Design a protein around this ligand. Structure first.
Ligand SMILES: *[C@@H]1O[C@H](CO)[C@@H](O)[C@H](O)[C@H]1NC(C)=O
Length: 223
């Protein structure tokens, strides 16, 4: 996360993290006691999920195994030029202990409206292009961009299942934040998908997988 700061400990209870040993792969979102949402491009043949964390060097915190990785059917593992349908549900091997410090987010039925102020968070790099990975969860305030301002920034790459967000002062998601949450007014509006290089350029905002477009698929898979 760029141009943000350390979040209030456990203030984002749904924040998950995909790990390959002691190596952070992506961020994630808790949507059920057995489900975690991420970007389909985060899929690995073997990885675990950490919840309730604030600092990565530290009883809310839990580490649970993955039973199943379910990418959106229309996602193409070949051709990573195409960021379409970059969403995936992870079925946990065991249930997560829910509490005030670890609880699922409420998915957004209504789509995000231009200008809406949201919050992006994660353990991704704090600078760009230089990699500087923080030890504690960072948080930043971002705003929902208009689709035309989003399309001009990425000619021919924006679909109706994507939404741009950013800040005039450079707040943005970056390396390691992928799969994480885009939360507006207490609700999950997006899953951080992709962006530009370097991150933090107002004219080149981060792109997010619009949750409102996929809520049908999401529920059908859990139930
Ligand atoms: C993406 O998947 C489609 C599925 O029909 C395939 O035709 C296409 O060639 C794939 N993209 C690339 C670059 O291989």
């Amino acid at each position: 996360i760029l141009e943000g700061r350390e979040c209030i400990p456990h203030s984002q209870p749904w924040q998950a993290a995909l790990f390959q040993g002691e190596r952070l792969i992506c961020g994630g979102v808790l949507v059920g006691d057995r489900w975690v949402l991420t970007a389909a491009h985060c899929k690995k043949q073997k990885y675990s999920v950490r919840l309730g964390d604030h600092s990565l060097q530290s009883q809310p915190e839990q580490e649970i195994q993955v039973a199943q990785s379910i990418q959106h059917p229309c996602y193409n593992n070949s051709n990573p030029e195409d960021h379409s349908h970059d969403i995936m549900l992870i079925r946990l091997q065991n249930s997560a202990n829910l509490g005030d410090k670890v609880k699922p987010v409420q998915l957004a039925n209504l789509c995000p409206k231009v200008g809406q102020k949201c919050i992006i968070s994660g353990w991704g790099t704090v600078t760009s292009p230089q990699e500087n990975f923080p030890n504690t969860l960072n948080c930043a305030e971002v705003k929902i961009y208009s689709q035309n301002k989003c399309e001009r920034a990425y000619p021919g790459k924006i679909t109706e299942g994507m939404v741009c967000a950013g800040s005039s002062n450079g707040a943005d998601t970056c390396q390691g934040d992928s799969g994480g949450p885009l939360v507006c007014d207490g609700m999950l509006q997006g899953i951080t998908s992709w962006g530009s290089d370097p991150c933090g350029k107002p004219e080149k905002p981060g792109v997010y997988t619009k949750i409102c477009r996929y809520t049908t698929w999401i529920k059908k898979t859990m139930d």
